[PDB]
Design a protein around this nucleic acid. Structure first.
Ligand code: NA
Length: 200
DNA sequence: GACATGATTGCC
DNA sequence: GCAATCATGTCA
C-alpha cells in the first residue's frame, strides 16, 4: 500500500526506468495474504519500433504485446518456449518496456522454494527472468495489469550500476550489441555477469 | 488453417 | 551440447 511507487515513477523512458528499477522492491501478495518480496538487481531495456531486438520492432503491435503500448507501469507478461513466463513493465514510449531479469529474494523464501520445485539454493530462486516469475507466482493472468494500481503486485521504493549487452539477443546486428542491460555490480543474485563490461 | 520459432531453463 | 513444449506471428 502506502509505499507503492506510483504512475509518475513509471512514466520515464526505457533506459532511465530500467536503471531506476535497480534497488526497488517487487512485492507479490498471495491469496493467503502473505507477501513475497524481491529486490530488483538486473533489468533489460527494449526501446520500441527502432529496437530490432524487441517484440515491438517495426511497430509490430498485437493483442498479445499490447501492454508495451499501454500506459507506463502496465505489465506485459508473455509465454516463452511454451513453458516459461517473462515479465516486462511498460515504460514511456509506445512499444518500449523493461524486462525484469533477476531479483534478490528478501521475504517468503520458503514459499518461493516451493513454487520453483514444480532442494534449491537461494541463488537459484530468482536468478533469471522466468525463474523470478515462477518464484513469485507470476503468469499470464498478470498481463496488462497496472503495477501502480493492482492489489496483487506492486513495486516499493528502494531501501554501482553496470551497463552491458543484453541476454538472449543473438550475435548479429547493431542492436544486439547495445548496453541495454543493467545490474547491480557485485551482486551475487544477478543472472549473468559480464566481467568485461564490469571493467568500466 | 498451416508452419516456423522463442528476451529460458536445466539435464545430457 | 541440446531437448522440452506450445501460443504467437506470418502467410494463405
Ligand atoms: Na511503453
Amino acid at each position: 500500500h502506502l509505499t507503492r511507487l506510483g504512475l509518475e515513477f513509471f512514466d520515464q523512458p526505457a533506459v532511465p526506468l530500467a536503471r531506476a528499477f535497480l534497488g526497488q522492491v517487487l512485492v507479490r501478495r498471495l491469496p493467503n495474504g502473505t507477501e513475497l518480496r524481491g529486490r530488483i538487481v538486473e533489468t533489460q531495456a527494449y526501446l520500441g519500433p527502432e529496437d530490432e531486438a524487441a517484440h515491438s520492432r517495426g511497430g509490430r503491435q498485437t493483442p498479445r504485446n499490447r501492454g508495451m503500448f499501454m500506459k507506463p507501469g502496465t505489465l506485459y507478461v508473455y509465454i516463452i518456449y511454451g513453458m516459461y513466463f517473462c515479465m516486462n513493465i511498460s515504460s514511456q514510449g509506445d512499444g518500449a518496456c523493461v524486462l525484469l531479469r533477476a531479483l534478490e529474494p528478501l521475504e517468503g523464501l520458503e514459499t518461493m522454494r516451493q513454487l520453483r520445485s514444480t532442494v534449491l539454493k537461494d541463488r537459484e530462486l530468482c536468478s533469471g527472468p522466468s525463474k523470478l516469475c515462477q518464484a513469485l507466482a507470476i503468469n499470464k493472468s498478470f498481463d496488462q495489469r497496472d503495477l501502480a494500481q493492482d492489489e496483487a503486485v506492486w513495486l516499493e521504493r528502494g531501501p554501482a550500476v553496470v551497463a552491458a549487452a543484453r541476454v538472449g539477443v543473438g550475435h548479429a546486428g547493431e542492436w544486439a550489441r547495445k548496453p541495454l542491460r543493467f545490474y547491480v555490480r557485485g551482486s551475487p543474485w544477478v543472472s549473468v555477469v559480464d566481467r568485461v563490461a564490469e571493467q568500466d
